[PDB]
Amino acid sequence: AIVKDVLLVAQGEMALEEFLKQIREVWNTYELDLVNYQNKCRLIRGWDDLFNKVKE
Amino acid sequence: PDMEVVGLNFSSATTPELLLKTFDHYCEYRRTPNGVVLAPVQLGKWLVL
Amino acid sequence: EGIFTGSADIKHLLPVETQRFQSISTEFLALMKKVSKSPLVMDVLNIQ
């Protein structure tokens, strides 16, 4: 009844908390792709999937 | 390459007002929590008097 | 950088412009080396 409604509200809140934690984990795990440029510098790659992840 | 040059020509009747006027022309005063500081207008370059 | 490095006669023809290009290329390379030293997205966002 009302206790079941409280339980499902808590379950949904925990599920969205886990989703937010997963997004935080993938962001603080994510690292830029660096590629050398004629031994002058390591240029940045991964523009397409970086922007795709940000938009998603 | 990253260092400006400013020419100052002293004379007999030279007072620190000349240095202050060069500072007013070539630099700005900005307030910081540490205190008032003075730096050249364009960043990343050292001014030479 | 490719044009100003590989192509010659730019220093003679456009001296002040190529000098500004080296002046800005040093700054970009320094910031790029900092980014390579700390390759995390949050870190490179949080640098000043």
Q: With touching defined as 3+ CB pairs under 8 A, do chains C and B touch?
A: yes
Check if the beta carbon of residue C27 is closer than 8 Å to that of residue C34: no
Q: What is the resolution of this structure in A?
A: 3.1
Check if the beta carbon of residue B2 is closer than 8 Å to that of residue B45: yes
CB pairs under 8 A between A and C: 26
Beta bridge mates, A37: A41
Record the tokens describing residue A39, joined without a space.
């031994």
Q: Is B40 exposed, middle or buried (0-12, 13-18, 19+ CB in 10 A)?
A: middle
Separation between Cα atoms, residue C29 and residue C42, nearest integer Å: 20
Check if the beta carbon of residue B27 is closer than 8 Å to that of residue B41: yes
Separation between Cα atoms, residue A41 and residue C14, nearest integer Å: 25
Query: Is B2's Cβ below 8 Å from some Cβ in C?
Result: yes
Exposure string of A23-48, with b = 16+ CB inside 10 Å and e = fewer, is eeeeeeeeebebeeeeeebbebeeee
Which residues in chain A (27-56) have CB-CB distances under 8 A to chain C?
27-28, 30-32, 34, 40-44
Record the tokens describing residue C19, joined without a space.
């000098």
